Amino acid sequence: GAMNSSNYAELFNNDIKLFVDDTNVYRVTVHKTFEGNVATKAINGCIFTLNPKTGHLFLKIIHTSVWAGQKRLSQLAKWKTAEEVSALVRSLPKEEQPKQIIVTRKAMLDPLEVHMLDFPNIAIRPTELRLPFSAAMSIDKLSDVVMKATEPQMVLFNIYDDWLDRISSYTAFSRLTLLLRALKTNEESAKMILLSDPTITIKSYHLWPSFTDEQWITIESQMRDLILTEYGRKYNV
Amino acid sequence: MNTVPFTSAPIEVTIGIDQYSFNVKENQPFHGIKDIPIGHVHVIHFQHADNSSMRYGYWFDCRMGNFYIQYDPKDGLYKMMEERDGAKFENIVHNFKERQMMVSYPKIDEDDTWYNLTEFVQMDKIRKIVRKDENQFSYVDSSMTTVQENELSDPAHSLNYTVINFKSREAIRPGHEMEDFLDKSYYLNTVMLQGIFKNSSNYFGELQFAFLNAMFFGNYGSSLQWHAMIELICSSATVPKHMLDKLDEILYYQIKTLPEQYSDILLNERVWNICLYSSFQKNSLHNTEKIMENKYPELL
Ligand SMILES: CCOC(=O)/C(C#N)=C1/CCCCCN1
Numbered sequence: 001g002a003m004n005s006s007n008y009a010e011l012f013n014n015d016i017k018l019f020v021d022d023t024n025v026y027r028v029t030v031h032k033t034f035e036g037n038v039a040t041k042a043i044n045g046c047i048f049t050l051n052p053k054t055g056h057l058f059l060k061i062i063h064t065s066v067w068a069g070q071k072r073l074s075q076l077a078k079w080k081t082a083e084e085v086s087a088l089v090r091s092l093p094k095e096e097q098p099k100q101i102i103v104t105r106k107a108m109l110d111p112l113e114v115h116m117l118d119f120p121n122i123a124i125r126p127t128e129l130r131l132p133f134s135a136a137m138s139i140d141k142l143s144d145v146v147m148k149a150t151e152p153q154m155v156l157f158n159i160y161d162d163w164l165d166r167i168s169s170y171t172a173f174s175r176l177t178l179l180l181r182a183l184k185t186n187e188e189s190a191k192m193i194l195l196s197d198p199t200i201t202i203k204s205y206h207l208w209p210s211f212t213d214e215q216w217i218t219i220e221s222q223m224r225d226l227i228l229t230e231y232g233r234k235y236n237v
Numbered sequence: 238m239n240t241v242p243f244t245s246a247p248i249e250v251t252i253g254i255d256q257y258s259f260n261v262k263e264n265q266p267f268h269g270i271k272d273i274p275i276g277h278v279h280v281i282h283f284q285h286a287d288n289s290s291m292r293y294g295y296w297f298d299c300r301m302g303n304f305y306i307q308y309d310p311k312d313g314l315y316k317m318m319e320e321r322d323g324a325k326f327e328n329i330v331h332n333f334k335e336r337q338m339m340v341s342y343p344k345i346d347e348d349d350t351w352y353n354l355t356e357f358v359q360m361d362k363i364r365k366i367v368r369k370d371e372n373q374f375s376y377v378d379s380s381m382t383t384v385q386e387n388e389l390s391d392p393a394h395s396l397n398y399t400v401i402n403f404k405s406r407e408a409i410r411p412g413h414e415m416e417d418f419l420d421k422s423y424y425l426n427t428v429m430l431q432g433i434f435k436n437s438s439n440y441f442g443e444l445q446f447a448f449l450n451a452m453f454f455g456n457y458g459s460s461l462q463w464h465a466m467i468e469l470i471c472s473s474a475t476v477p478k479h480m481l482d483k484l485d486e487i488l489y490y491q492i493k494t495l496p497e498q499y500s501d502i503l504l505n506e507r508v509w510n511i512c513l514y515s516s517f518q519k520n521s522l523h524n525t526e527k528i529m530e531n532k533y534p535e536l537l
Contacts, residue, residue, distance in 0.1 A: 079415035110404070114414045117406050 003102050003127035011052045012169045017100040018058075020085055021048040021133035022108055024146075025062050026077035042067050046146045047081050048133050049088065051098075053169045055160030055176075059142065060084045061149045082111035088154075089119060098122060104131050132177060135184035138191070141207055161206040166213065175220060179208070182223040185230040193222045239299030240330045240339070241281060242269035243315075244307040249286035250315065253294065253453060255279055255351050256494060257343055260286075268338035269306065271330075275299055277351060278358050280377075281306070282453050283315050292454045293378035298360040301373045305329075317374050353490040354449060357442035366397050366446065377450050383458035396450070396458060399433055399443060401465040403472075420517070422475040429469065437480045440466065441487060448491050451503055464508045471512035471519075481521045489524040492532065500533050510537055 003010075011017070025047055028040035045062035066080060067073050089097050100123045101116075103109060113124045137143045145155050160172040167175075182190040200209045211219055231237070249263040254270050261267045263286075273279060282294025295317040297304050302319045303326040309316050320326040333339055344351070360373075367375035383396045402408060408424040409417045417423050434440040444466040451460035470476055470484055495503060513519060513526045514537075530537065 076415070083414070110418070111415070113404055114409055114418050117404065117409060 001125070003125055003129060005129070008170065011173065013053075015100065016096065016098045017052070017102060018085075018098045019048075019050045019052060019102050019104060019127075019131065019133070020081065020108060020112070021050075021104040021131070021136070022078060022081040023105070023134040024048060024137055025081050026067070026073050042073070044146050044149055045077075046136070046142070047084055048136050049085060050133070050159060052173045055158045055164065055169070055172060057157040057159045058088055059145070059155045059157060060088070061146050061153045061155065063149055063152050066152070078108055078111045079115075081108060082115040085112060086115035086118075089116070089122070100125055102127050104133055132180040132184045135180045135187075138180075138183040138187050139207055141202075157207065159207065161203075161208050161210075175216070178220060178223050178227075182226050185227055189226050189230075190223065193219065193226065238272045238342075239275055240269060240271045240334075241273060241297075241299075241317075242305045242326075242330050242333055242339070243267060244305065247308045247310065251284045251286070253280070253282035253284075254340075254342060256354070259340060266338055267340075268333040268336075269340075271334060271339040271341055272344075273299055273342045274344060274351075277355050278360055278363065280449065280453060281317070291378050291380060293376065294453060295374045295376055296360070296363050296367070297374035301360060304374055317372075317376070319373060350490065350494060353486070354494060355445060356487070357438045358445050358449075359442055362439060362442050363446060366443070368393065368395075368397060377454055377456065379454045379456055381456060381458070383462060386458045386461075396456070396462075398447060398458070398462040399429070401429070401462075401469055403469075420472070420474040421469055422473040425469050425473040426475065437477065437483070441483065445487060445491075452491075452495060452499070455502070460503055460505075464505045467512060468508050468516075471516035471522075474517040476518065476521075481518060485522045485524045488522065489528055492525060492528050497532070500536065504533065504536055506536050513537065 025045045027043045027045045029043060030038060030040055033039050042064045044064055047058075047060040047062065049058040049060065050056070062077075062080065062084075067076070070076055085101065089101075097119070099121070101112060102125045103112060104127060106126045109124055109126055116122055116124060137146065142157070145153075159176055160169075163172045163175065179190070179194075182193070194209060200211060200215065202209050246261045246265055246267040247263070249261065251258055251260050252270075254273070270281070278296055278298050280294050280296045282292060284292050293314060295304075297317065302321075303323060304317055304319055305326075306315050306317055308314070320329075363375050364370070364373075367377060369375065377396070381394055381396050382390075383398050384392075385398070385400045385402070387395060388400075403418070403421065403424075407428055408421065410423060413423070430437060430440060434443070444463060447459045447463035447466065450456045451463055467484075467488065470480065509529065513522060513529060
């Protein structure tokens with residue numbers, strides 16, 4: 001069934017699984033027309049497909065051309081997501097195919113279930129965790145590749161950089177979920193935290209700065225402070 | 238006008254004949270049912286006074302043979318049988334009518350209810366859903382499960398309705414996933430109507446039979462089948478206009494005949510609210526919508 005706090009261990013076991021987040025697939029800017037009506041202009045999006053155990057991110061870039069001449073785009077986006085995830089699975093060798101795909105929003109269950117009927121042995125699951133994957137476009141290098149794309153394109157990243165050399169996947173996913181939750185609640189402050197120190201750089205082949213273990217503890221503490229703060233700032237506590 | 242004679246009534250039982258029913262007391266001098274209209278399938282059904290568990294019954298057509306009921310004290314039920322000696326049977330019946338030991342099938346002349354509930358139901362099709370080929374009549378009861386129910390355990394005692402499953406490869410063409418899932422016309426018209434049922438009359442006959450088994454026996458899988466067949470039409474953007482118009486009539490008489498106090502378990506809120514208010518055909522079922530709103534506004 002669904003995926004909740006009772007089973008954190010299953011995320012980091014040796015059964016291949018992927019999280020799928022469709023929240024950045026269909027992205028628009030809303031503006032006024034010359035006549036004073038409102039219209040949307042779509043911008044490039046992405047499907048965020050993540051192996052939580054290995055950190056492999058399958059970033060499918062959704063070029064705005066895919067929406068041309070189409071109706072009911074928010075419904076189509078869920079089916080387009082499903083179609084691209086199914087295409088990804090079929091492209092992987094059998095031994096790399098996932099045994100479970102967990103969708104971060106329940107509206108994806110039926111579109112994905114229907115696209116994956118050829119794969120009856122892959123479980124399609126919802127989750128109750130409130131995962132902050134929508135903030136993935138707050139990661140500069142991810143945003144950059146999506147915005148620059150001129151055509152449909154898949155780009156492969158490791159969202160954990162080299163962290164698994166030193167920490168476990170339960171800790172890497174926890175750090176990623178923490179950075180992303182912070183970037184989602186106050187992007188400016190989150191980003192100031194990550195970059196205040198000019199001497200800690202982001203390697204060309206990485207997404208996040210090269211923090212030592214001590215510096216990550218300080219960083220992680222600061223993101224908690226931020227999340228807790230904003231939460232007071234929000235409710236007045 | 239045909240007759241279904243009873244050998245006797247050894248145990249107290251409510252007997253149903255189509256949409257009619259009457260109470261027979263233990264060892265009361267009851268010898269069956271006369272004046273049964275020819276030209277329709279019928280169902281004769283039973284609920285023992287002492288065990289309201291298991292409603293059970295027999296679908297039959299008096300044109301297909303001479304049938305009678307006889308209680309079996311070993312198996313504990315009223316059993317339908319066929320009498321092949323035509324002369325022995327007329328002679329039995331005539332003695333029981335002379336001594337007036339039969340109830341009269343009580344059809345009011347204005348009343349088309351039964352015809353309207355069974356318009357497309359044929360005995361030959363029933364016998365393919367209920368597989369027991371040595372007999373010309375078909376037994377159904379409350380507990381029988383459907384072939385599809387068994388896939389999700391006795392095959393000989395299953396209801397072999399046509400499997401409908403909206404998230405299946407049969408229903409969804411490769412490359413038309415979204416289109417076929419949101420507009421099931423392909424699945425209705427090509428897969429089911431042209432490929433499996435051949436015509437809408439067979440479709441409607443199975444739909445009507447499912448409802449009647451759901452109503453008379455509270456057979457849960459029949460109710461699932463009836464709702465699935467309604468939903469497949471309503472979720473199709475492209476339906477022949479005569480089918481829509483006939484569906485409206487079919488469902489209207491079904492909803493009209495349902496006991497008021499059973500609406501809570503025989504009617505799926507989700508299917509009905511979708512069919513009448515969300516689906517492509519939301520505006521095509523005027524009679525059904527009007528009776529549903531005036532009789533079961535709660536559900537909606
Ligand atoms: C916002 C920070 O969130 C987390 O650290 C988190 C969650 N949600 C979990 C649960 C997922 C699996 C590992 C345990 N840590």
